[PDB]
UniProtKB/TrEMBL annotation, chain C:
It comes from Bocavirus gorilla/GBoV1/2009. This is Capsid protein. Belongs to the parvoviridae capsid protein family. It is found in: Virion. The chain holds residues 237 to 440 of 542 of the full protein. It comes from the Viruses.
Length: 510, 510, 204, 102, 51, 51
């Protein structure tokens, strides 16, 4: 039946591998609490050491489910088998369920806090599938579902940047701001999730959401040679190379050597030319993408009217550690420990470089723009990467290849928003008084993954991801990677190869 | 199914625009508590500084839903689009739902108060659609549903004026009052909402109410010229003007000038002649509508046996600030801050004046009564106005045009009354003892709005409501109008045009 | 007699919308990021490895294309544009400058914010207008997909990149056309072309 | 019927707004005269102050209708309403008529 | 929140007698031209867009 | 703008005139090398021969 004593779902988990598809199933226990005391608020974060960088933030009384990472949908076993056995994969269909909800009242009698459920209390659930509201999720956020199925998932408050602050900040000689800055505030949108229709559930209820992906494949393959090596060294070429007079060397006309043939295929795009600009508390990137309408007043540097573009490097080989993708494996990691620095996948469509001859030597071209006949592989994503990102709605765009490796889509999976229904309290003083409550429940995500198995005429063995590439750590230093410790600590991958990137194992004939 | 752990509704919100209709959807979380300790009481409010003004008030153990304002049914975005894109609109159908009810018991153990729900407790809901009881709502009350969907709605106690007090007050030389005043008390009606059949709901239940409007349109259009300018200046007129002898000027007979033709259309009605009478604690209006049967004893002035008629001015141009419509934007506003003074809509069917020649000059006619051939536009309502008012049941009436702009109807939307069901407590002393409880729940209002799009042969652009007409305020003074502040404070419109009145944007050929 | 002519358009939309934020602001400031920023040693400042601040997240979306680097070349009676697109086959004799074997490319600026009045779209409203009267200078639409800029850090400050070519992951809005604009233009017949986005706003 | 004293058309004008389409109608009185005395000619414009810039121009005994601007198809009222009420627009079908010739 | 729209209040006044508003005819019959770019009513101004 | 120079919307196609060939003729001599240089490799040569 249905009621308070009947569960609305069950635990779903594991994976199913087939030839043409993989089904991953993940359930988590999540917790949500009241945010902003049921208020919408617009705050200005303006760090003193932020070197003039600022944000406007509308914080909402809402929290949201973020499913975007690979590690949350794949065990390390399943990710290994995925990247070892398949040439490519993409998401096919997502199904998420929120069920087994429990709304407890929080009673503070003192230092001791007690918990008893309000059976008539309720919870708001809203999935935004048309992206009618500012997107909650962003790639590489820590809000994502946990990797370990038995770890609790704590939802993060939803907030959005209503405006670019330095454009709206009403600073300058004139009082009240310039005419252009005021015009940019006079229209600053304000979004409330309460403006949409959505669901209110009690403990005996549940909700489910389906999403259909239509996506480009994630290709797991490596180029064993660059596109320039695709010729045959033994056959001569008809091509002639003329070399102009250089100093005392006479100009010559000769047949190009058989072992260097000319290539038609350029280095992929990328920027090696920029450099990060401290301090670390500002936005530090080799490149800022800025918007600066005419008539605004800017008292800061490029950071703070613009966003840092990172990784700047494309398929180009990073010439410095600043250009490499890097992330901390846990939220408690700081400094040089817990960080994973990306290393080459040893694919020959990656780590490209472009040199121009000055007729003496070749010198590196740092900034490689889009140019015809460019051939490159997209970034070698690992088990920890964002799966997707939100593609901005715009008139025009170039080739969409986010350098972090996430897949940009017009409509990604919609964000499911959840908040505690407000339970007002009588107040003789007309104060705003609500009952303190929280919801815990079980959220499951089933994703169907369309996959393709490789076929190779290669005679020789190929690289595969092996547990022998794992490292040993822990409190007692006996615990291998992706295993729990004596304290229950989950041993994180130390290095980029332990994250099992794609575009490593399976060779590819160009 | 149905029960304590199953929600009886969901959150509905937003708007839907079409050509011939607009659907607005609004849900609020409301709270109600016990009123008058479950008693009916008749109180006499007789302020010492009220300058002899008094009221009889029957206060009831009831609270009521008030949906009458435009701002509660329209976001400022939706109101803008309504008044920019449509020549006229009226309400079509209302649907309200009370659901997701929670009755909590209030436990006071000390300075600390605890809240736990009584699942078998219940709540009375009564909609009066025949207006069999004194109307709860009145235009420009603060009891109305909030503008922000996430703000809690606190219901107000229902009460009504049983009688005009100075007529019933039994004052005079004779003891016990005159014969006429006693006769006016001997019949003073007394109304109990318990006399009607109505619904009692528990948490697992819900109720809904439908109402069908049949209304006059709210016309959003402006006259670019007065009705007197409707002639052609270049064609001569046949009309003759005779001017009698004035002093040493000889009487003349001549053809009226082509650029002044006579008009058939009089100034609309209005009173510029009255003045408010202090102090502010009495009823201060330029005009009192009084009832004074013969045989009553009146020891006071006109105020207190009568009601102030405000705005006194009709379509007539207010000659003083006293004659202008004015309101505070929030309940905490006092004095000169937070008040919005109405300003001209620059429609030429508004701000009318009437002068009579004394044969030397023209002098203003202050009081313009109904006269044949009068042409005027009804008040330019804003997003904050009452939508409707209750029209009194009476034998005879003149043209119904409330000067505040609210639409008078024989039957407006019925008032939904709600109170906490009394939960008596055993008392050995035969005291009246009840259990202290309150109800919070979700109330939704869907209104279908019949609309009409304008068509114009005007070549030139027309005025529209723009966000660039908004102003910037807040604690940090960075927050634009209709946006939330850092504290969560909602920035109120400072001026009358920011309230986006009608009869401004869309020109009209007379 | 009389004649009539019908034509059927198949066209891209003219989009009337504004971005209230740039594509770089699409994150949530309150949630932390996993991303690490390594800053190399600069002078006496030590190299540091730290978590990127929550209020600056890295963006995947580059500034749209444009040229801020060129400048018009007088006199006004020649072809004066920041850029000449020229054709110069081998064997021709050219006794002139770049103007006159080539055509001026104007507006040079893309979605990039014009850094000078030369880069702004400008026209006279009537055929009799001359000089500084009757001219309409384009001003920002206050859309955040317009007026873009690109800076590269030298590890001390950020310096403007004047010429922004096509680069992957670029996001921009097409020019904010007005009631006086060409609706369409003729697209040249050619083998190859890049993204077609005439900077005046006309639809090729 | 048809002849010298029968008009071949009428004045069409205005706009019609709907949800999914807008119809703009514009009629003009046009004038054309003889060009180049009925000759094709190839002229070289080579301004002395043109700083070496020149053009070859084939001028024809022909004139042409140019409909390409937005302001010619939209009144300022209609353009306002277009840009206020709609997120996007594109041309769908054009129909032009030359008639009432003298 | 409300959004920007094109308004006749953004027009300017000019003419021979300087009484004629934009997009209106003058005493001579001269049609008053838009002085500034916003009076030409550009697109990508009024209607906000969620990216 | 003069009637005989109108602004053009159409840019020059792509190309590289900036590079120069690097002798001797027995090596790979081109104005530009497209190279692949993964991190951790050892290169004792110039751009030619890893590209």
């Amino acid at each position: 039946g249905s009621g308070v004593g009947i569960s609305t779902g069950g635990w779903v988990g594991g994976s199913h591998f087939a030839d043409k598809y993989v089904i991953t199933k993940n359930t988590r226990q999540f917790i949500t609490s009241i945010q902003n005391g049921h208020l919408y608020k617009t705050e200005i974060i303006n760090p003193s050491n932020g070197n003039g960088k600022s944000q406007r933030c509308v914080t909402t009384p809402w929290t949201y489910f973020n499913f975007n990472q690979y590690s949350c949908h794949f065990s390390p076993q399943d990710w290994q088998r995925l990247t070892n056995e398949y040439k490519r994969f993409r998401p096919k269909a997502m199904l998420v369920k929120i069920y087994n909800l429990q709304i407890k009242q929080i009673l503070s009698n003192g230092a001791d806090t007690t918990y008893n459920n309000d059976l008539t209390a309720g919870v708001h659930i809203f999935c935004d599938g048309e992206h009618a509201y500012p997107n909650a999720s962003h790639p590489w956020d820590e809000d994502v579902m946990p990797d370990l199925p038995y770890k609790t998932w704590k939802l993060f408050q939803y907030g959005y940047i209503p405006i670019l602050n330095e454009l709206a900040d009403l600073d300058g000689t004139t009082a009240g701001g310039t005419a252009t800055e005021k015009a940019i505030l006079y229209q600053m949108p304000f979004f409330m999730l309460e403006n949409s229709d959505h669901e209110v559930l009690r403990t005996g209820e549940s909700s489910e959401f389906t999403f259909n992906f239509d996506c480009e494949w994630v290709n797991n393959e490596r180029a064993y040679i660059p596109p320039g090596l695709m010729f045959n060294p033994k056959v001569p070429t008809r091509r002639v190379q003329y070399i102009r007079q250089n100093g005392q060397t006479t100009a010559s006309t000769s047949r190009i050597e058989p072992y260097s043939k000319p290539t038609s295929w350029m280095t992929g795009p990328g920027f090696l030319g920029g450099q990060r600009v401290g301090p670390a508390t500002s936005d530090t990137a080799p490149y800022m993408v800025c918007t600066k309408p005419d008539g605004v007043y800017i008292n800061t540097g490029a950071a703070g009217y613009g966003s840092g573009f990172d990784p700047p490097s494309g398929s180009l080989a990073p010439t410095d550690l600043e250009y490499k993708l890097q992330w901390y494996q846990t939220p408690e990691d700081t400094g040089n420990n817990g960080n994973i620095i990306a290393n080459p996948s040893l694919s020959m469509l990656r780590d490209q470089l472009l040199y121009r001859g000055n007729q003496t030597t070749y010198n590196l071209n740092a900034d490689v723009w889009m140019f015809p006949n460019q051939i490159w592989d997209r970034y070698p994503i690992t088990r920890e990467h964002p799966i997707w990102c939100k593609k901005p709605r715009a008139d025009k765009n170039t080739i969409i290849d986010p350098f972090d490796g996430s897949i940009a889509m017009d409509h990604p999976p919609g964000t499911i928003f959840i908040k505690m229904a407000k339970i007002p309290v009588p107040s003789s003083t007309n104060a705003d008084s609500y009952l303190n409550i929280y919801c815990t429940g079980q959220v499951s995500c089933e994703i169907v993954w369309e996959v393709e198995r490789y076929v190779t005429k290669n005679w020789r063995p190929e690289r595969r991801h092996t547990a022998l590439g794992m490292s040993i750590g822990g409190t007692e230093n006996v615990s291998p990677t992706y295993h729990v410790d004596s304290a229950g600590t989950y041993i994180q991958p130390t290095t980029f190869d332990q994250c099992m990137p794609v575009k490593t194992n399976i060779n590819k004939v160009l």
